[PDB]
Structures are given as C-alpha cells and as structure tokens.
Design a binder for this molecule. Sequence first.
Ligand code: 16N
Ligand code: 16N
Ligand code: 16N
Ligand code: FES
Ligand code: FES
Ligand code: FES
Ligand code: FE
Ligand code: FE
Ligand code: FE
Lengths: 446, 446, 446, 192, 192, 192
Amino acid sequence: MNYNNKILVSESGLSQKHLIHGDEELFQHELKTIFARNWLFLTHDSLIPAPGDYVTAKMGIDEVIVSRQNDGSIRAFLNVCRHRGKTLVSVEAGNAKGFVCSYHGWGFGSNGELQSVPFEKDLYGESLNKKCLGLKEVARVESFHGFIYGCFDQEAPPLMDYLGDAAWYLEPMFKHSGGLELVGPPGKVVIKANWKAPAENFVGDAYHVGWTHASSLRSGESIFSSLAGNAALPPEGAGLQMTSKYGSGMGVLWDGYSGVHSADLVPELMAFGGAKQERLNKEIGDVRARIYRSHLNCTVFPNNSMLTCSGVFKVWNPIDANTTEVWTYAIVEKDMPEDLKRRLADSVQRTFGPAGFWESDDNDNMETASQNGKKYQSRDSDLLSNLGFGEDVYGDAVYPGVVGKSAIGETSYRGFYRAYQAHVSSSNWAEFEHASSTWHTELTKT
Amino acid sequence: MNYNNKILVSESGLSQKHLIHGDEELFQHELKTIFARNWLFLTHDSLIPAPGDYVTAKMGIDEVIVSRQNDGSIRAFLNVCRHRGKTLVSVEAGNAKGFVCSYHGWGFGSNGELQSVPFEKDLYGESLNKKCLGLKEVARVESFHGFIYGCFDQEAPPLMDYLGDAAWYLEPMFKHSGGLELVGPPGKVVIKANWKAPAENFVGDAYHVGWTHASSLRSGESIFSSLAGNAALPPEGAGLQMTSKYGSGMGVLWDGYSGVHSADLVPELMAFGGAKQERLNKEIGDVRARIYRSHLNCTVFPNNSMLTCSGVFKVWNPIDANTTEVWTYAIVEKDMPEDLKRRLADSVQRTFGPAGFWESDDNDNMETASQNGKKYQSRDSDLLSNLGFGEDVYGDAVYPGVVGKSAIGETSYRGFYRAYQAHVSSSNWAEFEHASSTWHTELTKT
Amino acid sequence: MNYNNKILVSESGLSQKHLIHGDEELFQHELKTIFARNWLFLTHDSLIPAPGDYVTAKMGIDEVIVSRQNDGSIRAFLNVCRHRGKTLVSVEAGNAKGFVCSYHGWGFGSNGELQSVPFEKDLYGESLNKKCLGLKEVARVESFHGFIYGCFDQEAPPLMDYLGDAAWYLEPMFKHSGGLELVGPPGKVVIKANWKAPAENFVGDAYHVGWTHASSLRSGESIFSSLAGNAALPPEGAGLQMTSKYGSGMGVLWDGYSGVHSADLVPELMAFGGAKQERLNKEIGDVRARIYRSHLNCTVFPNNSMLTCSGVFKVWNPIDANTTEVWTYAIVEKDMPEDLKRRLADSVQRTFGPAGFWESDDNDNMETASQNGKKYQSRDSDLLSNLGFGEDVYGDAVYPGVVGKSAIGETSYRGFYRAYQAHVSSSNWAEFEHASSTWHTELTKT
Amino acid sequence: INIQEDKLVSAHDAEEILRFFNCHDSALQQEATTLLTQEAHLLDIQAYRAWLEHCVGSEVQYQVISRELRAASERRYKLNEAMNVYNENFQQLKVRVEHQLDPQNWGNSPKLRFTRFITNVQAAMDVNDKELLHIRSNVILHRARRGNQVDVFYAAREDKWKRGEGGVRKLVQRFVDYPERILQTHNLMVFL
Amino acid sequence: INIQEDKLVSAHDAEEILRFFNCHDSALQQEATTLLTQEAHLLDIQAYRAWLEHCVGSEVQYQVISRELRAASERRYKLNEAMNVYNENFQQLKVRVEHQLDPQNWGNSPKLRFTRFITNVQAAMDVNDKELLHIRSNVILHRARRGNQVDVFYAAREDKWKRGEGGVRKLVQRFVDYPERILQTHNLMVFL
Amino acid sequence: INIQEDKLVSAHDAEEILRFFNCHDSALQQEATTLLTQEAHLLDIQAYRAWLEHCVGSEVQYQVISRELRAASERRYKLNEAMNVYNENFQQLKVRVEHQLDPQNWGNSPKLRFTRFITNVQAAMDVNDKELLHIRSNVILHRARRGNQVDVFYAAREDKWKRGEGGVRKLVQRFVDYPERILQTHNLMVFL
Ligand SMILES: c1ccc2c(c1)CCC2
Ligand SMILES: c1ccc2c(c1)CCC2
Ligand SMILES: c1ccc2c(c1)CCC2
Ligand code: FES
Ligand code: FES
Ligand code: FES
Ligand SMILES: [Fe+3]
Ligand SMILES: [Fe+3]
Ligand SMILES: [Fe+3]
C-alpha cells in the first residue's frame, strides 16, 4: 500500500476505510509514523516521586524504563541491554541506582550510562568504550502537571503545544484543582481490538453511551443514568465536543462531576466538586471553573484516554492490528480526603477496570468492529463519522479549538482521524505540519 | 507470486504444487478469485421457512445474515453495521423483523434497509441519507431445490448453469425424490487443514475409503464394508466419476443407498430407497431412478460437499491456509417417516459429525497433507492426480460431463483443479470463460 | 530486504543487527540459504544400528525419515508421501522394511522406493511409473565417528571439510576415546527464542556462565563452581576459543572433564577421564590427550551444539523467528561402565534437559534477546561481539583455526556470524567460497 | 430457584438444582466419587472394553449435544435447537469401542495419552425410583498425541446410574450440553 | 514454616498454612466441599440472585487483587502494591448481579456458558471466633461464548464463611490474589 | 482387565488398576486427599524447604519420564524407550530446592505464581508391605510469570507414601509418565 497516496481517511475526516482497524502492514507503518513520532503516556510523578524510583512502560511495542534522576528530572531508556540485547528489567516498578543485566552482568546506571562490566580490565582492557554504550534514550520526556509523556522523535513539538486547544479544557482539573495524582498499579488486560477502536470511542463517542451502556446505567444509578436504553436525549446545552490540530480531542458533559460512579459516591463527589468550583470561580472565571467539574471524555493522541471526574485513565498499548493491552489507572485530586481517594480508585476499577462492568459493555463493540476490518468484503468499506458535520466552529470567543456546540456528535472523530491521516502520509514532523496548515478549515467545511 | 503466469496446476489437472495447501498469499488471493467470485452454500428453505426467519453463514471469511423476506424471497447481507462496522448479529438463527446494532443503536430491516437511527431528528436533522446506508447486500442469491447459495459477483453464471453437468446427477435425489430437507443445527469444528483438502477428498476420492476408513468399515458394518483394509476391490461397473466446466464433480457408487450408515439402518433404508426407485423408473427412466438411490460423493465448487444417501452435508469454511471450520448438516428426504429422519440425522452426526468416527479417520490425512504444503522442501513438489487419465470421455450418450467409467479414479480431482487454476489466473468471469473454452478437451487428452 | 547488499553482520563479525533474531522474512530466507545449504544433525549409529531401524528428524522445518539400509549405509528421505502429500511416518523411532501411507495405502521401501500401490493393475494398469515416484531423498548423508549429518545441497563440502579446524578439537573425544554413543530418546521442548540465540551461546559464550548460572553453580557444586556470581575469574591459561571457515567453533576449558555434573559424579569422572588421558598421551600426544578431557562448548554450524565431558548434545530446530524446538540427548563414551553411562545420561537431563536447572537459567536470556529483535526501536540496533577482537591468531603451531588464547571472549561469535553473513548474501556454495576466501584475515584484523 | 426472578436460569437447570439441595447424603457423595474416579481411570488407560463391562448399563443413553446459539429474547423460531454429537445406545458405544481398538485405526499410532480430572461431584437418589442414582460432575479431559497436539475439553455431566449385573452400579444415562459451540479440538472423539 | 529459611514464602502464606495444619476435622472438610460445590453450581447455571440469597452474607467483602510485579529484593519502593479488580460489599455485588440480568446487557445474548472446577478444599474453624469458618479452595473457571471465545481462569480462594439467616453458612469474605498479572481473557467479568 | 482383549491397555496400567479396584477403604482415600492437598499447598506457596521436611522421605525416588513415540505394532526396536525429565533422590531434590531459593536465581524475580489442582485421588495399602501406601492422583499445575507467561501442566501421578520421622506419612516414590511428548511450556521446571 502506498501511504503517500492512499486515502485512508476522506476529506474533513468524514469517513475511514475499515481496513485501518485490521491491516497488519498499516499497523507496522503506524509504529513508524504514529508511535515513533508522537507523544505517548509514560507515568505520573506520584508513581516515581523519589530519586531512584522507576517504572516500566510501553511506547508502541517498545518497552522503556522510566527513572527519577538524582537531580529531580526524569529520563527514559529502552529496556534492552546494549551487549546482546536481553531485556534489562523484568519488574514493573521499584527503586534502584541502576540495572544489572542477568545475561553477562553489565551494569547500567539509573541515568542509562554503562557503569560497569564484569572483569572489564582482564577481558576488554582499555578497549571497551563505555561512553558510547549507554542505554538507548528516549529523546523527549516532558510533564503536563505531573503526567509524564515520552517521544522518540526529537523533532516533535513541545508537549504543551502538541496538546493544542485541548490543553485549555484539561487545565482546570489538571492544574487549577491543585493537581492530580495517579493511583497505581494499573489494571492490565488484553483485548482483541485495534488500539484505535477504544481511542476513537473515548475521544468523541457520547452517542454510544445510552445504548451500549444501557445495563450499566440502569444498574449503577450514576448521574448520567437517564440515558439508559436511549430513554432520554440530553437537553440542548448539555455539553460540547472539541478537537485540535495534533489530534487530541474530547467531549464535555456539563456538571457531571460524579461521572460513572454509582449512587454510593454521588452526594460526596457532587459536594466536593461544587465546593472547589465556588473557589475557582474567583480565580479562573465561571466557565473554566465549571469545566473543572464537568465530565471530560478525552483522548490525548494517539493512544492515551481518560474520563475526568470519573477518574478513569487509560493507555491503549498496541500489540498488533487486532490486539491491544489496556492499562487502567485512577486519577484523584490531591486535596481529596484520603478515604475518598481510596474509594474513588476502587470505583474506577469497579466500573472501568479489568472487571469493570461498564468497560465490559464495550468489549464486543471494539473487538468485532476491529476484526471486521480484516474481512474481505469490509476492508474497502467506509466507517462513518459525519454526525454534526457542517455545524462545527473554530475560533469561538469562549471555547477554543474546532468545536461542536452539542453534547453528542462526531466532531472529535473527525479531528482525530484528520491528524492520523496527516501522520500516516508524512515522513516527518515538517511534512505533518505542511499537511496540516489548513486543519481547522478542513474540519469546519459546509 | 504472479498468478497470471505461475503454473499451480499442470495441464489436464494432472498435478498441483503442494504449496497450494499452505501458502497464505495464495489463500488471500483465493478470497478474491475463488470465494468472492463463485457460488457458496448459505442455508436451506427448511431452516428459514417463515417470514423473518434468519441464519448467519460464512461466505469465505466474510459473515452474512440470510433472511426470509415478507414476499417469500431470500436476501443476504454482510453482518456488519454501516456506521462504525460492528458485527450486527451475534446469534446463529432466529426470527426478527430487523437487527439493531448494540453499539449506537442503528436499526436495520430484514430487507437490509436502514430503518431507524436513535434521535435522528435532533442529531442528524435531515442530513443522514438512510437510503444509501443499507447493509452491504450479496448480489446473487439463488435456490437449487431448496438449497440456497450466494455469490458476491453479479457477473456469475446462474446457479443452475454453474452446476453444469453435475446437476443431472443431483436431480434424482434433489428434485425427483419429492425434495430434501436440511436438518440443523450443524455441527461445527475447526480442523488444521486447507479447505481444499476435504473439498478434493469429497469430490473424487474413492481410492482412500478402504484404507483410510478400514477401521470404520470393519466396526460399523455399513454396505461399503467389504472395502475394509483394501480386502476387496469393487467389481467393474460398480460406479463412475464425473466432473464439469465450473469445477463441481462427484463419484457415483451404484445402489449404495444406505451409504455409511451402520447395519442398524441398512434394511430400512434399502427398502425405502428401492421402493421410491420403482416409482421413479416410470417418471425419469431406469438409469436416473438408479442414480437417485446411488451414493454420490460430490463437491459443489468450491467448498460445499455432500454424500447423498448417507445424507452428509458439509461446508468447508476457510479461515487461513491451514485452518478450516467444518459445518456438518444432515440431509433427509421430505417424505421419509419422521422417526426415520430423526435416526438418519443422528447417524450422519455419528459417522461424520464433530465426533464422527468416519470423519475422524480423515483428520491426519487432511491436516498433514495441508501442513506439509508450508514445508520448504515440499512447497514446489507435485501432488499427483493422474489416476484414470486417458480413459475419461465427454459427451457420452447416457452419462453427461467429463466421465470416468470406473468407481475409483482421479477424474474429479482433475476437473476441480482445472477450474481452480482457471479462476486463480483470471481477473473476472469473462477471463475464466476464455480460459475454459476447451475445458473438456483438456481433461480427456491421451 | 536485499540480502545481497544488507549488512546484517558488520566486518570481522564485530556486531549483528538485532533484527536477525526476530525478522520472519529473514527466517524464511534462512530456510533457503542456511538450512537447505548446510550440514544438519540427524542421528547417531547407536540409535539406528540394525537394518530397518529408523528415526524421524527435522532438517530446518522439514521432517525426514532416516533409515539404516540392508547394506549398512544410511539414507534419509522427506517424510512426505509422493501421492497427495500426507506425512508418511507419525512415530519417532522404530524398525521396518518400509512405510505405508495411511491415506491411499502406497507402500515405500526403507530405501525410499515406491514398492507397491493398492490395486495397481486394475487402477493404473502399466501407466504408473513407480521408478520416478520414490521419496524425495536427502542428497548428502555422512558420518563423523557415528554422528550422522544430512545436507539437501549436493554441492556442499564433505562433512569432514565442513568441520574445518573444529574437527581437530573434536577428534580426541569423538575418535580417540574409542568412540561415543548417543543416549536417546531426546528431551523435546519448545522455547520462544530464535535458533541463533542458543547456537551463539553454545559456540562461544563463557562470559555468561558465572552470572547467568550463578544459582546452578552455587547449588550443584560442579567443578566450574568457583565462577558463581562472578566471584572468581578463571586464571590465565584456563582455556581458549576457536572458530573456523564454515562457522563451527568452540570454547575449550582445560581439564574440566566432570563439566556441569554435580559433586556426586565428580570423583568418578575425574578418575575415568584422567586414566584414559594417560593412555592417550602415548598415542596422540600430551596436548591432544588433554583436549580429550577438556570441556568443549561447541556449535557445529548452524544449529547443532554440545558440551563434551558434560555430555550435553543439542539440536536447535527452527520453527519461526521466535520459536525453536530444543532436542537434548546425552553423549557417553562407549567404554564407560554401563552404570556410569546411565547416571551420566540422567545427569545430562537433570542439568540441561526439559527440567534442566542449568538450561532453565538461560531461558529468559534467549527468549527476551530474541523477542526484542522484533521491537521497533531495536530492529536496527547493534548486538555486540567485540570481546577479544584484535588478539585472535590464525595458523598457530599448536592450536589450529582462528584462535583466541583466553578462556572468555567472543572469538567464536565472530566466526559464526561471519559464516552466517556469507551464506545469507550468497546464492550457492560457490558464492559462499568466494565470499570467504579471506575469512581468517577478516577475523584477525587489528 | 424462581426463574421469573433469576432471568438467566433455564427451567431444566432449576429442576436439576432442586434435586441436590434437598436430601444430602454424605455416603452417597462418596460412593459417587469412587464410581466416577474408577470410570475415569479405566477411560484414561484406554480400557474401553473394561469400561463397557464395568461402567456402562445395557439400557444406556450416552448423549452429548451442541446447542445452536439463539437470542436470549427469542420466542418465535422453533426449529431443532440442538444436534447430537453423541446419542448412543450400548451397541453404538460398542461400535465406537471396536473402532478405537482396531489395529487399522491409524490415528491411534503412536498411542494417545488421556488424563481426566473429575470434580464437583453431587449425588442424589431419585424420588420415585429408589434404585436410580442421579450423579452430577464436571470433567476436564486432556488428550495429547503426535508430539505437539494438545486438546482440552471441559463439560458438566448429568448422569443416572443404576445397579445392574452383580449389583454393580452402572451408567444408564449421561447427558452433556457441550459448552463450546465451535470445537477448537480437531474433533470431539473422546468419551466425556 | 520458618520464612527466614524458606526464602520464597510470604508471611501471609505462612500464616494461612498454619491454620489448616493444626486441627484437622474431616467432617468440616466435607461440609466445606458441599458448600463450595453448591455455590459453584448456582454460579454455573447463572442463578446469580439465588447465589446472593443462599451463599453470600450481608457483611461480605468480595475481593480480587492484581499485584504489581516487583523485584524479589525490593525494600525501598513503598507505593500501593496492588489494585482491586473486585472489592465489593453486598450492595456492590447486587449491582453486578442486576447488570448480568438486565435484558439490555447485549453481551449476554447468546447466553454465556460457565463451567467451574473446585479442588483442594481445606477447612478450619477460627481459633477466636468459634462461628467463623475458614475455607481455602482452588478454582478453574471456563467461560465460553459466541462460538469460539474461550476463557479459562485459575485462582486460589481464601474464604471466611459464617452462619447467617436460618443457620445457613454464607460467605463473609473471599480473597483472591489473581496469579496472572496481565489478563489474557478479555476481562475478569466472572465471579471467582 | 484382560489386555489380550483390551488391546490398548499396557500391562503396567492393568496392574495399577487392580490395586484400587480391590479393597476400598474410604478412610484411606480421605487421608490421601488431605496428604496431597497439604503437599500441593506447600508447593503452591513455594515453601520448598517445608515440602522436603514434611512431605518427602529420605529414600525418595522422584521420577518424571518422557516416552519416545513408537508404533503401536512395534516389536523389534528395543532401545531406551524413555528419558528421565526427573529421576531424583533426596539430595538431588535438595539441590533443586536450593537452586529455587538462591537470591541469584534471576528467573525467580519477580516472584512466580503457582496454582495446583489435585483430583481423582485413589489410595490402597500395599499387599505385601503393610506400611506402604499407594496413592494415585491427577494434577493440573498452572504457572504464571512475567506478566503474560502462562504454562499449564497435566499429569497422572503414581505415588508410594510411607510413615517416616514422627509417624508422618512421606513420599517415597513418585512416578509420572508425562503425557505430552514435546513440551509447550518453555520447560518442565515445576514439581509435579
Ligand atoms: C461519557 C461517559 C462515558 C464515556 C464516554 C462519555 C465516552 C467513553 C465512555
Ligand atoms: C464414498 C464413501 C465415503 C466417502 C467417499 C466416497 C468420499 C468421501 C467419503
Ligand atoms: C561452559 C559451561 C557451560 C556452558 C558453556 C561453557 C557455554 C554454554 C553453557
Ligand atoms: S546481554 Fe546484557 S550483559 Fe550481555
Ligand atoms: S457501529 Fe452500529 S450503530 Fe454505530
Ligand atoms: S497421500 Fe499417500 S497414498 Fe495417497
Ligand atoms: Fe463505552
Ligand atoms: Fe474419508
Ligand atoms: Fe548458559
């Protein structure tokens, strides 16, 4: 397939070829043009707070060691020994000043440097240039309010610019709330879906909630529960959708601070969020204080998703075109009482974890939509994302980005896939920029 | 591999490259040139007799919904939602006026039309063109005496013409017997064989029976039991072999109406078949009345096989080059007493079902012959099908098609593979026809 | 990938691209340029000593039947029927005058000839040319002191020449000891490693022993036990490394006759080996008598390895780039007391068999180093084998081959990979020879 | 069980539950365990004739079904719900046993390896037939052959056992509703 | 067990061992076996309401954890060692039960098939609470759906059971430390 | 069993059957079940020293074989039919135990997870040695490590147990004929 020419995503992001969810050659191409090029979620400050603390993380199909340095910074390195290529670290988290390979015993520092080689004097003499044998380092590692992302491409935009218009929406919860913590360890489960299936669902799919999650809505009594079985359409002004230049996007459901949490947490959460909102009114204004306590379903392009307020935090780690390893963390606000943090974390896993009953509702949807992309008569078929097209705006006086002023639509699918196609057909960041110089105009046509 | 030029099947169908049973690139090519082009078995009238009745079926690796319309016709559609591509129907059979997608709730009619979209007015307004969003329909659906076949290629010959000379042999049992019913549900088992391995076996392999099935013949006491361990060659005139332009073929074993059925059913069946034969003598003539009560091992090209009289009905559903999902139904004559139909159906499954002891005899044969096609030293080796070559005739005054007037030979392998090669090397039906304009001459050489 | 041009192994064998352990296209290319071209281990005289005795063996991914002929010779044939390609023999060993196919009953002799076809007269008449239908024969089958190797390429050098300089080191144990026997049946286990990972480890990796096998060394009390946890570097003169033109190589650890055997066998073995050494001094000289009772870790290129004295004998049978089927036999000296042979065989399996506690130490090393070769950021990375480079010699007055006069180094990696690259980039033996005309000069640079 | 409330429960399953929740007899559960463990041992070593002689009653119905996947809400489509993978009387079992033992059963060389794991044994005497013993048990059946073929079967078995010749308790009915619709084990050629 | 000598043994596991090695009561082991076999039967037929009514105590804690993989020698890193796949009180179990029974739970059509294998049952009364019964057992749980989806779960269960309404012994705590870190079963949506 | 009639049955298997079909003692079957359940618990928590101390006799032979695949009709080829995956005396088991417990056994970090399922327990006293207890049982052994590595082993175990120090019944012989010829579990580094 010629990725320079092949139209995988049609103009304005209105449709995508179903093969994108099943084609292994394209998956291999995505490793280069999506995963090696873009910002990928690694960890949070709260998981590696002290010098020597480390975790392992996936970046695409690669595995990295992410380590807190003595100077307070974070560096990340391929989890691969520079000698004969053995995996260096076999655990998920810990604290160490270095990592010793179990094959021939080479010792690497937390800073990636080759520090020791067994019997170096007798074996290598002075001939081994250890200075050139440090672990392969992730070029770019940056933080968004404690959330640490990595990028293999030195040419990438800074993480803040990469978030583009999405950053404005995230800031009330990520910054102005006093800060978030990530509660680990994550749940980890393999699903038989393409990584794009849950990514697209979290970025912009409010339409599915009432039908897909009818049973969870009915059974759990959460605040979005009037949606069960499509019994009721949210009123006008119930929310909006947004998307951005580099592909990140989200839905906003106004005031939904208790999110998917069952009735047992609703009164406590609605009180806590409302109280903080009243304080934030004076600092960031009414609209942004309201966004703080509004439910955001967001994907940070390409494969990190979240539900703020619900507190669900996801990495869709790619394995192959029909296999994804799902990591699920909980996010909590630092200034929440500890007992509330504990119950919130359990509730995130209860609803969206390995045995998350909400998440279970999505399984067949994600898996079959992905697997059908391999089927002969469906490969060249068109997946539709035209809902709300021709009603999006850009440059609004109040809400930034390409914005659909309605709670349910496909605005964020269109921006996600526009960015995806621009990357797949480009050889580097400069070409992506050239392919994106009229991004918002393309999305707001008709 | 260049399929226009590569000789996968030699002249006159005398041999085939062993790679055809193992090569995944060729399997992918077969999806286009075999499965998307030819007639494939879907269901029987008896399984969807009433308006709204439906079943799911495979066509190649694609899945379809096959539905009885209000007007009495049958239509078939891809089991894939036109929105984001989720699998629409998750059951194997039922009755419904339509199908609702569990993802976003789109509702399709039994006629494939997009009938409803949740909150269409509020969300899409008048902008969604539902008329263009019907399920992807199988272009051609036709019946052969209640047996329903589908074809994705609008250019295919009518099903009756496609059956070619094989139809004459099938008609006494399929038409003149008063009609057959298919007894469901089918057994379903995955085997590690190429679909062509059982297809070729059923189309033309009487040679294997005495040796492969020695234990089943000895243990069951069926009427073909003198064959056990190659203890006895069938007499001259015991049967014949035939093949046809579009690849379908069969063996005929004269008078073998009780087929593989154990001694417990032999007297009842031989009486029933003989009695109907006496009636049919006056209607269709002695020869065709005899064919009615003669055992036919047939493959309807490419991947539907059967043993008439034994009542075994098979679909070899392709998964990959070394994986096939075997569906096994029973066929019975409509005017048989109900208790006999019941016992016949159980006996079909007893012998050739998921725990069919006869079918089990074939497992290693099919699986290893297929898997060896991947092995380096065997890929370019020649599978032989030359038995009886130079003794076949065409245009016989009594028996139509390319015919070998002997019970055991490889006539039907040659015609199956001649048609296979003509399809693999052709881009459409017109090219197949051009490649087949001397089909019978090629088969009757020397 | 263009194998004529791609530098997979750098000059002097100093490094290899990590992709060589994970790339499936290269694995398929190796079937042609490595496995179909080179000498592969089949069996030992001691396993098929009598006329009619046979075993099955893998050669690459192909399976062969290896049979003792009436005239005392051994012939090997593809385990594939010449009719419709079924696997002929389903057992691992036995005694027979021939092999009958379970599909249609064709009977082949132990000499590969098609001897009988059921009902040949009635079915084929005189038309079947059985003379041309013998099993596909392995072109070359030769013995090295009872150890039987096969090669599909008629153009290969004789086995003795192929062993090159390695033969001199093997001869004291393989020939001058009075001869070895192979004790079967082998252990068989699948590991998720590339075949090259254990091959390279056995050919030249003494560096890993003290660290990888720290626990086995500490727990078993074997004679190499001072190495545990890199507690002690072997003294200077403790051993050497060698490699050869056609890729075979080994390490020599002086005097280590009890090898990996736990303390329970040490006194018995050290007495037996020392006693034979004293006799051999007078026949083959002190140095070669010493080599006899010295521990050799050897790979006979490409995928047969051994530890002499320890008595471990390995075949790394390739399945795909990250899957290898490990066969483990024991070698014993024929003139050892039978009870010692029995205990030695059990000890080989105890240490290096399916539940070999030493072999278990290597699992993660082999598996992860192999699997990392598929990971995007590691494919183009360089595996290092530069230890001892610039200190190797050729044409030494005492020790032949390219030799590193030190116990621990990567000399044998360099020669293994030099030969590997020469084969991968060559279309036949003549091209390999041309690519190898300065083999030792390349290895001894700097 | 109230199946109007417990919406997922079939009438058949509810009936079978009631059978065991009532009179619990520990001695019967132990007898049943021995009976099934001995049966499994005979099968595992492929003593098929011994299994017929010692474990199988002359009036046996040995049945394993495969049920078509239908909608939970389906109420109109009325055609055959299941097929019989097995539905054997004693003579039909004997045919299968002879097929296994035949020296020209090529698939049985090299010899197969069977290992059965029987758990969750429950036993209750029939209310109406004081000589009819209901036994329920679950089986994991492991079949290994030809170096690297491995097939694992999982099932619940609803049995009736009755004293026959010599007072020996023998199987008079086995019913299995096989839980996997599409078999991934090459075939179901094992005695569950 | 001396965990200074038996280096691989956790203090928790050593404590749990001691509980059963002491007073062995055969009758209790039999009662425990019946209790667990009946529980498994109710779950297998998807009688989730019946399971709650008959098997689950009002004060239940139903907990399944997934423990982060850490170095055997780790002693500095002190952050949350595990997450809760399940950590349910009775009302939370009831929510999950209603979710299973809801007619718009699309994933439950066609009906799922469950088969549970319960083994290695051990039982001991609590030393301090004479009405608290400790039961340990292992489970293999087989879930089949949609033709060719098959998921097999394996776990050890540390239970406490206590007599509740009507003198019926009911589950008041279940603890499972799930042995596979990354699930290969699509989800853990089964009651272990 | 008549092995001339039951053609698929080995003389060894026929001998082992006879041992249990004879004197059935329910109490012995219960003792055997407890013994094996406690052994499995010690192994599952990796209390290998405790297993040696409490479960393994000083005169033990601990043996697991892998038998070469041969023709069912083979009668001429007479060479070694099997190899020993395990064939350990007490000291050799101790070596393996020390290897497991060594802090430089890199493969044991992060800690492995074991779950054993023991079923089909049969027990009979030896006819000639009144202190020798024959126990037969089947095992499913689940080993999980490193996030997504999962290996499941299946076997039948022929044991002899005898009272040793302190009157404690201990294993003096275990024999397993491993049913899969080519292991698909990376290794057989588990105590069956
Ligand atoms: C609101 C509530 C839940 C979810 C969304 C929006 C998208 C993913 C799941
Ligand atoms: C007669 C009887 C049985 C069979 C054939 C012919 C071909 C397939 C199986
Ligand atoms: C000495 C001793 C053991 C081994 C080597 C050398 C290389 C492979 C294992
Ligand atoms: S592979 Fe890491 S030290 Fe050699
Ligand atoms: S995928 Fe079917 S309604 Fe959206
Ligand atoms: S395939 Fe061997 S005789 Fe036909
Ligand atoms: Fe959802
Ligand atoms: Fe057949
Ligand atoms: Fe090693």
